């Protein structure tokens, strides 16, 4: 498999022992961008600019 | 070690941007590159930020 990289903003979550366990790609979809703006992987009900 | 650099021939222009001449030997650098070339006297000023 071959893919090509792109300049992106990622939100990386580090676990207790220091390994990356999850990430959010900000430019993928509006929900991911909301997560990047709030700096959290869970978003509560509401309207977020 | 910049002691030998000072011990070399007297310098027409020894100007340090980010750093300070004397404060060198006191710092720790990630990737030193040195670019050597020959230019005229009035062209020395053009090599500057």
């Amino acid at each position: 498999y071959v893919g090509y990289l792109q300049p992106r903003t990622f939100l990386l979550k580090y676990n207790e022992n220091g390994t990356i366990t999850d990430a959010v790609d900000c430019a993928l979809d509006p929900l991911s961008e909301t997560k990047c703006t709030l700096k959290s992987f869970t978003v509560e009900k509401g309207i977020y600019q | 070690d910049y002691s030998v650099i000072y011990n070399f021939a007297p310098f027409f222009a020894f100007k340090c941007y980010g750093v300070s001449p004397t404060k060198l030997n006191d710092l720790c650098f990630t990737n030193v590159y040195a670019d050597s070339f020959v230019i005229r006297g009035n062209e020395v000023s053009q090599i500057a930020p």
């Binding site: - | 980010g18 750093v19 300070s20 004397t22 404060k23 006191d26 710092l27």
Partner: protein, 49 residues
């Protein structure tokens, strides 16, 4: 929550260069001569005030 955010922002403001070469005062004072270190420290002081 509000209080926390304020304090958090304040701490993050210590990681801002405010136009200086570095956001760490010790690094600046270990990198530059006192005259230019004065200018950089002045920018940092203005930002933090």
């Amino acid at each position: 929550n509000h209080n926390a955010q304020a304090l958090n922002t304040l701490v993050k403001q210590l990681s801002s260069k405010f136009g200086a070469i570095s956001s760490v005062l010790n690094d600046i004072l270990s990198r530059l001569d006192p005259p230019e270190a004065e200018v950089q420290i002045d920018r940092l002081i203005t930002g933090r005030l």
